[PDB]
Design a protein around this ligand. Structure first.
Ligand SMILES: [Fe+3]
Ligand SMILES: [Fe+3]
Ligand SMILES: [Fe+3]
Ligand SMILES: [Fe+3]
Ligand SMILES: [Fe+3]
Ligand SMILES: [Fe+3]
Ligand SMILES: [Fe+3]
Lengths: 289, 289, 289, 289, 289, 289, 289
């Protein structure tokens, strides 16, 4: 029922650092501010990523998008039935997020979520990258995806699939040590292979990384050099086994939070078949961190 | 449930003026008369626009099309259930409109509507424009669209969506003054971004303008010169934020009633997402009136 | 529910004449016999048209095809419920028609119909025309169409649509005299604009004509010369207003029964809209008979 | 060396008749006048066909187009070398024809020809047909073609090919009587199968007919009805053996001068092979005159 | 300079056998006769293959086609210069071959050749196969190809390439025995990989086989069954190493003369590179004879 | 022989103004400096436009590009033969222009030209617009075009065509007053309709305007708003008669020097035909200056 | 005049190492031997790369391919005229290289070259990679390219371009140190951006590296892992500035000789323009050696 991941908000110790990072390195377009949040664009939306000051140095909230007012009410009904606590956003928050309506809640482990509809668009102010990137693949598939760290994967799954409507794409057993592996669960809610992945990682953050998809392979290759020059590279170029995203990872200014910049993944449809993978990389992705 | 806007009828103080306007300027094909109404064609339909003498100088009625006899009966049932008053058209009116069946009613604010099915087509008399226009985009998306002025938008919405079946595409807050803006609601009932838009405008007419879509950009550019020569231009070429219709506006011979001539808008489908815009123009559309 | 018109059987006074006609003029492939019926092919089916001796000089029966055994049983249930009398074909008839199952019945006015499934195909004996025709458009749309003459159109309609599942495409008012016109009703049951049309014609036959669709326009042009040389032409080339079939008509050896040979008609889909036409010809089709 | 047939001028006894004919029947756009010549357009050229008063009731002259000033001078040199008499057009004639330069001459049998370059175009006045025709195929292939009647075909050939540069496409032996046939020679100077054809016909005119090519088959079918209603049809629809032009012929208001309206012919290229045909019609083209 | 192989003439001991073979097995269309030669068509040409009575039971002559009259004269000049004896065909022979002009000669080893231009075409009598074959690939690439047996390959090469203009495509060393192999030389004169191949085979005939190319793979598969039923198969289906023709061979009624029926070979262009192959078959082509 | 217009250099009274103009308004990418010239990029070239301080406020020089070293030498030979004075650029100038070789000269009326080869490209520094423009159409067609003002058009023509190799596309008679018109000559040297146009305009500058071609129509529409906001618009959107460039004009910071921003013009090829036009605008282009 | 690089032969100290390398790492297909040379295939050619024992540990010879026998003779004539010493290969060498003819020579600095024609192909033994690679891009563009180290670039250029016919694509100044850069010259002889590049590198080998082009990007990514596992990687993935080859470099078992494995480069045509680049990498290609 959730249609796609619409936006992301971070609370960070170094806002200027994040600002230079999202613009000069990632290529996002600086789009003013809202309250104490610096806004960044990747397309026609008024904003896609917000950065506000905070000791968390983590993802502060994620906006899950539905297609209309009725859709939002149906979601409220679903939350009620599932016994999930939520608060309807007030005029102030609606004004802040630039949405027509939203329900604020949390997943089983504390990550604030905001189900909303009616996002603001500013076509009269065409997107202009701050670095050389031909553009980002968003649209119906949203802004990108992120891997959510959870203490209990089965519990996170029930909520994301049963309450929010995400559908399992596949699983990848991620080798942690000699005989230690974590089964990462990749979920989709539209054509993007996965919008949210759940994994029991020994990480002190709400997420491992967030991913943005560029239009061309050169976008990625160019982006890799920009981040290598910034000395932020954590992995060499590679392609994933399940979604086939060709990408590289890099450190954001927030310790233990990374960004993935990729291109050309496979998409999901009705006939999608659940499968299991033993490795995350088809090829490449050698760790550099 | 209404499938598309099929026809439009105007009651005007200057019929010869409207006649020269629809033909020499807009390019429509004169198609004889019915009663005291001059008929005009834009394609294979026996008529699409009718012009009759009247002090109103406004839209007299709008024909909403359904795909068959059963569809019309289902609509009657819906009107009954909604408590909406209607009268089945008699042989005379059917003969006049050249339709197989129709229900006559009014929207909440007095605009006569006629739900019909089985329109007449005259393929043996191929459309021939009266001015240089390659053709119009009609077909499944109907004749075009119009913006309906209403005193109460919420009330108009309930009727058009709940009773007639239109679906909200998006909203554009139209700046009226210093701190005055009107939220225009754009509704679709097929692939055309919108067939009817509702807005609380301080206009003494039932509508602000009606829109026709030509096949090429040159059609529009050529049309702009024809209307500029007639001195009717009210806006320069531009493209809208929501549907991306590239067009210009011009005054019809009826004061405060305009026509929009455009090309290449985006179309709507199942996956359409409701959004909000702060401006009507992506670019251009500078007021000239 | 009927999926398409699968076959046609004629009972004629001059079988050799019909044989030379279907082969040398129309181009069908002679395919042996079954009982006292000469069989003719137009594609991979064991037969599409059968010709047997008889004083009728008219269509003897029409095979309406469904996609499987269950489909046929569902149709029997429907006939039962509608009070329509029918007999399940015996081994003998199944053997004769080369089908896996069939129900024999009659429409409201005596035309024998046979609802069947599991037709026989002989791919090991590729279709070979008897005259120069690149091929026929059949497949999912069946063998072609025919216009059924009826005394009561409303009564025929109820049966064909309500009992058999055909859907109205459109209507054409056919001028008969000074102030006499017959509203022909065109029905579809798949992508072919119409498989059966009903009209109250003052003709002493069950049908006016049957139609076959060739692959190219040259097929038709070539066919016209072949039939003109046989002196059978009844109409010049033309294109119809509703389906846009480009064709010509010719007399079969059975008096008052004609054949239509055409190309490139428009096809029907979910979004089809019922409409009315005042003429049968878009252009051409001048009577020659 | 001649690049294409650019224009045609007729001298006729009934100008109003020719005017109604070229516009209401053929669909050409009336384009004012030059001297005592009424001009008609088929596309972006200022004019393509001119009609002036005269007892001839025949083609008065044909404009053969080259691509530039040098090209015209090279042609003058060629005429000089071939001993062909010519006169360079004066300012007056250049003004009249709306060309940048032209050489006036005659073919071996008296038909005035004008080799020119730099034709005038009026894109600011888009072509608008006077009858329903989607458009004409001109461009690099010129306005169309015409069949030139000559007393000596071998003599006409030497001139058109050796002096003017036309290249033989093929020949069609046209049966005249019991044992009388005329070998028509079809010549091209660009992609159009033929721009000029030569034949020893017992006709008292400089040409048999001129041909115009419409964009669609419906254009032709529609045109046939328009001319049949005018009672001018001389041949039924058909397709030619050599160029495969699908067309019909009709009488112009000038006795023994016809017009051919067609669609979809084959085009010529480098690899074209000369061939011989025994008939003019692939199919159709039955004489009606 | 020769443009393509246009026709073939055989002199055979059993004409009725060859007639049933070319029609019922190969699928060619019987096209009457000329003198004592039975003619057969494969497309729009008046004839492509001729069969006349004779003790030879071999290829009697091959028609090499040029694009026009000048081309033929240029070829005569070339023959003169090369000292090759030739005779211009008289009206009688021109009438017999249905060509506009031809030069009769012989290759270095006695095979009569006829260089001609202006072949006759009969589009008013569309090709109609005598057996199920969708059509043949001819056109600019001619009727097909044949392998010419010669006592001296170097001598044959000089003539075919130096005098007639054929260009070497490649060579295939054909294993004859333990340590005996014949280098077959494949020559092209257009896009067809080869129109004539030369090889020093111990065969008492002028040729080994002639080849015809069908439009689809099913054409070939179907043809194989037809000839297997006739018990004429000499090789199983296979694909050649150099041209990639997928085909099978079969015996004609003339002992030691075979026919090849194939599909989908590669074509030749300007950039073609000469190469050498050790086998004739890429796969398949197992001998059955 | 000149292959395309590679670069442009301006000498202006207000460099900061030109800098803000080329970047914020036009969208070019600032690319450092060379000597006292500020460089700007539109694609992969190290620079395309240079701006240096000077009282001229006009085009200082134009770089005409050839494909290699030999090409440049052939051009020197041509200049020698034509008696045109030129100087080979020294290491310093080569270093300044970033080219491998260049010849410096002047056209008949003082505009410095530099024929060069081997331009520098910096793919490792991807083009990044300074304003929202999807990109520019350059490549084989160079950077764009410019209209050169000359006192004697015939004299300018001889030089540009006879010495430099440009080819005339067409002419447009530009109405100056009541009975005063200037015949503008448009020249091409590649697929771009024209790279240089010559016209006898009463302007005190070397050029009237220079033109840049964007990838999309939205690029232009967006650009128009940016320049209108800067209050520099001199013409409304429109499309030209000859090249069909859809564009608008605007004033550069240099008085009487304008810029044209357009999209979608037609391109030129071998078969191009010289023609004459009476107006510059197909539609639109209303003067605003 | 040389058409493409056909083959390469190496003389190496460790043949088994090279064998495992070309097969298990690169993916080439082992194809037996010739004399003391192990042969390897990448496509339909009998062999593309040969490896023989030798102390050189360098490229032993390069086969330059022409399209036919005449072409080879024309090349001999050219060598004679240029005073370049050469020896026609004997039966033995022809047998060894599997070519129909070849001329053996050396470039100005000792690298043996063999101009040949008529290479052997074995389609009956389809290419089968020894490692996972979808295939290689060869065909008309040959096997790949190599960078030739030379002491005098101007001298090497004159020979390769003036004697052998290669054409300069572009130049890249390769930074060697603080103020030391080597101008690498890239030459083409077909569509491949470059087949041979010349550069004054301080390397004790005849070449720096040879390049092979795979069909997909995954081929390269997969290949990179295979060679990284072998610990041979010398550069990370990257894309070149001039040809845009996306690739990585790796060490062959021969010290100071590398291999480049890439995909998707740009191709060259008639309109190619010579240009200069300051870096070899568009992005990536970070040194790892
Ligand atoms: Fe990821
Ligand atoms: Fe509108
Ligand atoms: Fe019909
Ligand atoms: Fe004609
Ligand atoms: Fe063969
Ligand atoms: Fe311009
Ligand atoms: Fe390389």
């Amino acid at each position: 029922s959730i249609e796609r991941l619409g936006y992301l908000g971070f609370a960070v110790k170094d806002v200027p650092a994040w600002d230079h990072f999202l613009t000069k390195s990632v290529g996002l377009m600086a789009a003013g501010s809202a309250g104490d949040a610096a806004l960044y664009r990747a397309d026609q939306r008024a904003w896609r990523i917000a950065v506000q000051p905070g000791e968390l140095d983590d993802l502060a909230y994620a906006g899950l998008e539905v297609d209309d007012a009725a859709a939002l009410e149906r979601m409220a009904d679903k939350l009620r039935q599932a016994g999930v606590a939520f608060t309807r956003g007030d005029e102030a928050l609606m004004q802040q997020r630039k949405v027509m309506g939203l329900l604020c809640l949390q997943d089983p482990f504390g990550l604030p979520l905001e189900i909303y509809y009616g996002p603001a668009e500013i076509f009269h102010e065409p997107f202009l990258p701050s670095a050389p990137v031909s553009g980002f693949v968003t649209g119906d598939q949203g802004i990108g995806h992120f891997v959510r760290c959870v203490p209990d994967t089965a519990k996170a799954m029930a909520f994301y699939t049963e309450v929010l409507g995400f559908v399992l794409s596949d699983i990848i057993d991620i080798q942690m040590g000699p005989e230690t592996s974590v089964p990462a669960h990749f979920l989709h809610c539209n054509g993007r292979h996965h919008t949210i992945a759940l994994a029991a990682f020994p990480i002190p953050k709400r997420i491992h990384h967030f991913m943005l998809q560029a239009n061309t392979i050169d976008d990625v290759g160019y982006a890799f050099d920009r981040l290598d020059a910034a000395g932020r590279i954590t992995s060499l170029l590679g392609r994933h086994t399940n979604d086939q995203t060709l990408s590289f990872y890099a450190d954001t200014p927030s310790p233990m939070i990374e960004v993935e910049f990729g291109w050309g993944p496979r998409t999901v449809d009705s006939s999608w078949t659940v499968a299991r993978h033993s490795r995350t990389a088809m090829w490449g992705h050698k760790s550099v961190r």
